[PDB]
């Protein structure tokens, strides 16, 4: 029967959506990738030098599908963990804002994310349709 | 006491910008909810204010 993103494991669905977005030539990566920490909390760029932006976009799209609507600051709160503040106690450091802004604009160009009246951005019918389609892809991929 | 120089230093903020409202002191001040009463006078007048020892 029909299948939503809630019926598929998070990590596998996100990996498959990243792979599918990477395979097709859409979802342009900003020219400043390979450069950025992705947050003040981190101290190195992603280990996967190329393709990590697709993973982040997949995670963002799944997050907007699951939740009500999400802006950029909320994603900054979501991503980013604890900064090793040298010899001081760790705290919570918000993620980089430019990366998430570019992710949301790229998702807008792909048509998967729509601007919501209540502020932030919500899921769009076409994009959520592709999300269910690739959730089915992963689910019948499992067995 | 030239008016240009007397009390000329700004006092918009910091330790001495606000006083105790009881004693005029600048130490041990309680700014919570706009009390602006220092701790000892707060301990004295808490019951009159509405604050009680409860748990």
């Amino acid at each position: 029967p029909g299948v939503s993103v809630r019926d598929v494991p998070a990590q596998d669905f996100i990996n498959n959506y990243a792979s599918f977005l990477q395979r097709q030539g859409k979802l342009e990566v900003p020219g400043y990738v390979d450069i950025v920490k992705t947050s003040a909390g981190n101290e190195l760029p992603p280990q996967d030098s190329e393709g990590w932006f697709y993973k982040r976009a997949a995670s963002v799209a799944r997050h907007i599908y699951l939740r009500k609507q999400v802006g950029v600051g909320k994603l900054n709160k979501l991503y980013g963990g604890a900064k090793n503040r040298g010899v001081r106690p760790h705290k919570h450091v918000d993620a980089s804002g430019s990366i998430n802004r570019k992710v949301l604009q790229s998702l807008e160009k792909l048509g998967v994310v729509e601007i919501s009246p209540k502020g932030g951005r919500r899921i769009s019918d076409n994009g959520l349709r592709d999300l269910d389609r690739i959730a089915a892809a992963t689910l019948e991929d499992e067995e | 006491a030239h008016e240009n120089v007397w009390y000329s230093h700004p006092r918009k903020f910091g330790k001495g910008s606000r006083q105790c409202r009881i004693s005029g002191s600048h130490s041990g001040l309680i700014r919570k909810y706009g009390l602006n009463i220092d701790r000892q006078s707060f301990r004295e007048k808490a019951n009159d204010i509405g604050f009680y020892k409860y748990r």
């Binding site: 809630r6 019926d7 494991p9 998070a10 | -």
Partner: protein
């Protein structure tokens, strides 16, 4: 109206509200099926009522659980207790007495918390120490 009731299960600060209806064997938590509980290694904890009772006991019964508050494992135990209590309450309300008593015998003979909420809750902290019931340190010199 559809025979359906609502129960709940709590942990330290977790709370799972479970609606039980006469369905088709449909068990979802937070809109996701039980097989994908937030963690992974306490998954058997949340299957535990299923396997202790036997799935065929509730094959035409559907489960919807919304779990909020508390950390991961507290939420998991909340879903555990919520599902167990929902099954027991539904069987009491609409099925039969002996069925509910047999479910309670299968449950309470195993991890009593399955039907009884845990009594332990955090101890308030006190001045003179960084812990709820610990002191800072002494110097003596």
């Amino acid at each position: 109206t559809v025979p359906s009731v609502q129960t709940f299960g709590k942990k330290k600060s977790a709370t799972a509200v479970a609606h039980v209806k006469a369905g088709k064997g449909l068990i979802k938590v937070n809109g996701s099926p039980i097989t994908l509980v937030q963690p992974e290694i306490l998954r058997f904890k949340v299957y535990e009522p299923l396997l202790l009772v036997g799935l065929d006991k509730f094959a035409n019964i559907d489960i919807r659980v919304k779990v909020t508050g508390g950390g991961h494992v507290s939420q998991v135990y909340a879903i555990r207790q919520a599902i167990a209590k929902g099954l027991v309450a539904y069987h009491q309300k609409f099925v039969d007495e002996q069925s509910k008593n047999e479910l309670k015998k299968a449950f309470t003979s195993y991890d009593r918390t399955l039907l009884i909420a845990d009594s332990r809750r955090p101890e308030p902290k006190k001045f003179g120490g960084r812990g709820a019931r610990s002191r800072f340190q002494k110097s003596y010199r």
